[PDB]
Every structure is written in structure tokens, then in C-alpha cells.
Design an enzyme around this catalytic site. Structure first.
Site, PDB file in Angstrom:
ATOM      1  N   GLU A  79      39.382  -7.102  65.676  1.00  0.00           N
ATOM      2  CA  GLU A  79      39.356  -5.832  64.960  1.00  0.00           C
ATOM      3  C   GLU A  79      40.266  -4.801  65.624  1.00  0.00           C
ATOM      4  O   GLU A  79      40.980  -4.067  64.940  1.00  0.00           O
ATOM      5  CB  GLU A  79      37.928  -5.282  64.871  1.00  0.00           C
ATOM      6  CG  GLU A  79      37.028  -6.003  63.878  1.00  0.00           C
ATOM      7  CD  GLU A  79      37.319  -5.640  62.435  1.00  0.00           C
ATOM      8  OE1 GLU A  79      38.106  -4.701  62.195  1.00  0.00           O
ATOM      9  OE2 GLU A  79      36.754  -6.297  61.537  1.00  0.00           O
ATOM     10  N   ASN A 135      42.969   2.770  55.338  1.00  0.00           N
ATOM     11  CA  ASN A 135      42.689   1.906  54.199  1.00  0.00           C
ATOM     12  C   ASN A 135      43.351   2.444  52.935  1.00  0.00           C
ATOM     13  O   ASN A 135      43.784   3.595  52.894  1.00  0.00           O
ATOM     14  CB  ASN A 135      41.181   1.762  53.993  1.00  0.00           C
ATOM     15  CG  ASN A 135      40.492   1.114  55.178  1.00  0.00           C
ATOM     16  OD1 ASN A 135      41.033   0.202  55.802  1.00  0.00           O
ATOM     17  ND2 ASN A 135      39.293   1.587  55.498  1.00  0.00           N
ATOM     18  N   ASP A 190      42.047   3.157  50.050  1.00  0.00           N
ATOM     19  CA  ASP A 190      41.250   4.148  49.331  1.00  0.00           C
ATOM     20  C   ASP A 190      41.275   5.521  50.002  1.00  0.00           C
ATOM     21  O   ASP A 190      40.672   6.473  49.506  1.00  0.00           O
ATOM     22  CB  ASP A 190      39.805   3.657  49.180  1.00  0.00           C
ATOM     23  CG  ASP A 190      39.110   3.460  50.511  1.00  0.00           C
ATOM     24  OD1 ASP A 190      39.803   3.411  51.548  1.00  0.00           O
ATOM     25  OD2 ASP A 190      37.865   3.348  50.519  1.00  0.00           O
ATOM     26  N   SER A 192      40.302   6.098  53.197  1.00  0.00           N
ATOM     27  CA  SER A 192      39.414   6.113  54.352  1.00  0.00           C
ATOM     28  C   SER A 192      40.112   5.509  55.570  1.00  0.00           C
ATOM     29  O   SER A 192      41.192   4.928  55.450  1.00  0.00           O
ATOM     30  CB  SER A 192      38.121   5.358  54.047  1.00  0.00           C
ATOM     31  OG  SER A 192      38.389   4.015  53.689  1.00  0.00           O
ATOM     32  N   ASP A 216      39.510   3.409  59.515  1.00  0.00           N
ATOM     33  CA  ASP A 216      38.678   2.697  60.475  1.00  0.00           C
ATOM     34  C   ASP A 216      38.928   3.228  61.885  1.00  0.00           C
ATOM     35  O   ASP A 216      40.065   3.537  62.241  1.00  0.00           O
ATOM     36  CB  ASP A 216      38.953   1.195  60.411  1.00  0.00           C
ATOM     37  CG  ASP A 216      38.750   0.629  59.019  1.00  0.00           C
ATOM     38  OD1 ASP A 216      37.894   1.157  58.280  1.00  0.00           O
ATOM     39  OD2 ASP A 216      39.449  -0.343  58.663  1.00  0.00           O
ATOM     40  N   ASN A 247      34.241   2.338  59.440  1.00  0.00           N
ATOM     41  CA  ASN A 247      34.832   3.015  58.289  1.00  0.00           C
ATOM     42  C   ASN A 247      34.299   4.430  58.072  1.00  0.00           C
ATOM     43  O   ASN A 247      33.094   4.674  58.166  1.00  0.00           O
ATOM     44  CB  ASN A 247      34.602   2.174  57.028  1.00  0.00           C
ATOM     45  CG  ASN A 247      35.618   2.459  55.937  1.00  0.00           C
ATOM     46  OD1 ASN A 247      36.056   3.595  55.758  1.00  0.00           O
ATOM     47  ND2 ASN A 247      35.998   1.421  55.201  1.00  0.00           N
ATOM     48  N   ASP A 277      21.692  -3.188  57.787  1.00  0.00           N
ATOM     49  CA  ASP A 277      21.580  -2.691  56.417  1.00  0.00           C
ATOM     50  C   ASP A 277      21.543  -3.810  55.371  1.00  0.00           C
ATOM     51  O   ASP A 277      21.620  -3.547  54.170  1.00  0.00           O
ATOM     52  CB  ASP A 277      22.725  -1.714  56.111  1.00  0.00           C
ATOM     53  CG  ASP A 277      24.054  -2.409  55.866  1.00  0.00           C
ATOM     54  OD1 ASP A 277      24.231  -3.565  56.309  1.00  0.00           O
ATOM     55  OD2 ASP A 277      24.931  -1.785  55.229  1.00  0.00           O
TER      56      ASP A 277
END
EC number: 3.2.1.17
Length: 128
Positions: free
Chosen positions: A35, A46, A48, A50, A52, A59, A101
């Protein structure tokens, strides 16, 4: 800061990531490797809009606030800049809430594609 393999493993173990939610220490180290290449200051944009952040590339869409991701959530209740610290405490605490989650470590694309189903034990081999 750029961590060493065994150095990060010891740090992660101390923060209680070993066997957390059924995931051995080898999985978390492998995830960190692909990562961010063990670099705490790593950032990636990203499509969209956003971004990281940090050792585990968390994110801004759902987990942190960077102030430039309109209509996003701050579920870990931290500024995204706190995830770039040389102290991995913030990144570990947030990762614990993410892995719980429902989707597990599948939330990390690199783990799903490059760690899942492999000998993750090899990533902690040789370490004290």
C-alpha cells in the site's frame, strides 16, 4: 518515516494488531508493504477526488477529514494529516474500526490482490 520490515512488525504487535479480528500479524505487514512501501508520508489521489493517506492508505471518503472531499464522512474522527505521523497510533486505531465494519481486510485493494491466499507468515520471518 520509512519503516523496516521487522521494525514495523514489532510496532504493530505492540498496538495489538496481531490476530485482531482473526488476522495474523503477517497480513498487516504485507498490506503495509504494497500500500505504501512502509512509508508513513505516502499519499495518493483517487478518481472521485478523495485521497488515501499514510502507512495503510486510508481513504478520506469515509474515514478522515482533509477538507477537500465534499460530502464525505469522518468516521475515525481525525484530520487526515494525523495519519502521516511517524507515530502509527492514529493509523492503527482507525484501521481497527475499518476491519470491523463487515468486509474485513478486503477494504484494502492491495491486500485482496497481493496478500490474500499467500504465505503472509513470511513477512514476519526472522524478526525478534
Amino acid at each position: 518515516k520509512v519503516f523496516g520490515r521487522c521494525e514495523l512488525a514489532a510496532a504493530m504487535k505492540r498496538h495489538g494488531l496481531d490476530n485482531y479480528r482473526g488476522y495474523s500479524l503477517g497480513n498487516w505487514v504485507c498490506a503495509a508493504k504494497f500500500e505504501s512501501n512502509f512509508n508513513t508520508q505516502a499519499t495518493n489521489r483517487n478518481t472521485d477526488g478523495s485521497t488515501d493517506y499514510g502507512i495503510l492508505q486510508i481513504n478520506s471518503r469515509w474515514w478522515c477529514n482533509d477538507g477537500r472531499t465534499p460530502g464525505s464522512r469522518n468516521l475515525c474522527n481525525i484530520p487526515c494529516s494525523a495519519l502521516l505521523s511517524s507515530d502509527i497510533t492514529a493509523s492503527v486505531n482507525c484501521a481497527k474500526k475499518i476491519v470491523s465494519d463487515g468486509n474485513g481486510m478486503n477494504a484494502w485493494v492491495a491486500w485482496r490482490n497481493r496478500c490474500k491466499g499467500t504465505d503472509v507468515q513470511a513477512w514476519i520471518r526472522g524478526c525478534r
